[PDB]
């Protein structure tokens with residue numbers, strides 16, 4: 001479960017990069033579609049990491 | 058060019074439809090019951106059988122039957138409102 | 142430039158229409174319904190709990 005943690009950092013950093021790239025010059029629908037395609041696998045992976053690690057939080 | 062088509066037009070017979078237009082509002086309500094029964098029993102078996110293979114099996118088969126009756130249901134059910 | 146009762150005429154089109162494509166309309170609706178049920182099957186049976 002270190003690869004799941006590796007899949008947990010990358011989605012939060014990924015949800016900051018598309019906000020910065022939104023701040024520079026892009027329109028809305030590219031931000032929103034990129035947020036969907038990044039949005040779903042990070043949901044499944046991050047949920048399974050918080051379930052896996054668990055008791056020491 | 059015009060004469061071959063024009064003598065080929067009177068040499069033919071008329072057009073017989075597949076199902077007459079005044080019959081279709083019986084098949085509409087006679088389809089809408091069956092597709093609700095089959096599709097309702099399809100989404101009903103998604104509960105906790107805790108057996109993955111037979112649940113995918115039964116759900117796929119009853120979804121196939123429900124789809125192929127919903128198609129004919131909406132085709133006959135659209136010609137009796139006035140949008141062909 | 143054509144007038145009411147002196148240029149009425151007909152127009153003739155010849156075409157073909159097989160028995161194959163006569164039955165493709167309810168199979169098109171039926172394939173969209175069938176590919177709509179499987180999303181509810183995959184979306185419904187998938188783990189989203191955060192506790193154990």
Ligand SMILES: CCCCCCCCCCCCCC(=O)O[C@H](COC(=O)CCCCCCCCCC)COP(=O)(O)OCC[N+](C)(C)C
Nearest residue numbers: 015019020021022023024025026027028029030031032035
């Ligand atoms: C089903 C439809 C729902 C209807 C809801 C109401 C929709 C209308 C409200 C919009 C109000 C006007 C806002 C506005 O004028 O700006 C719009 C930006 O347009 C927007 O996206 C407004 C975003 C408002 C904040 C959203 C908060 C929700 C949190 C989402 C995670 C223009 O965006 P753009 O100019 O296209 O993007 C360029 C922006 N740069 C910073 C890159 C320059």
Ligand SMILES: CCCCCCCCCCCCCC(=O)O[C@H](COC(=O)CCCCCCCCCC)COP(=O)(O)OCC[N+](C)(C)C
Nearest residue numbers: 085088089127130131132133134135136137138139140141
């Ligand atoms: C299980 C059944 C599946 C769903 C059934 C599908 C319903 C069929 C209606 C689809 C949408 C039609 C919308 C519509 O514009 O219809 C109106 C004429 O207006 C009408 O008569 C529409 C009345 C429809 C009543 C709907 C009842 C509620 C159905 C919700 C499930 C006709 O307008 P026009 O499009 O201008 O017709 C002439 C133009 N032609 C190109 C055809 C020459």
Ligand SMILES: CCCCCCCCCCCCCC(=O)O[C@H](COC(=O)CCCCCCCCCC)COP(=O)(O)OCC[N+](C)(C)C
Nearest residue numbers: 078081082083085086089130133134135136137138139140
């Ligand atoms: C989710 C629940 C939503 C329910 C919403 C309830 C809305 C109630 C009001 C509906 C408005 C009526 C629509 C309507 O105008 O229908 C009438 C008369 O139509 C008929 O002849 C009845 C045919 C019914 C067929 C059954 C279809 C069931 C599937 C629908 C979901 C059209 O018939 P006519 O106006 O006579 O058009 C003549 C066309 N011929 C081909 C017959 C010549």
Ligand SMILES: CCCCCCCCCCCCCC(=O)O[C@H](COC(=O)CCCCCCCCCC)COP(=O)(O)OCC[N+](C)(C)C
Nearest residue numbers: 011012015039042043044045046047050189190191192193
């Ligand atoms: C504004 C709304 C947008 C939300 C987008 C996510 C949508 C999730 C929808 C969840 C559907 C409900 C199912 C569910 O309960 O899952 C939640 C789910 O708990 C959560 O909320 C965590 C979801 C976020 C995952 C973390 C990754 C970060 C997401 C990207 C920003 C976890 O709660 P449970 O694990 O079920 O609680 C304990 C178990 N009981 C048996 C007691 C119920």
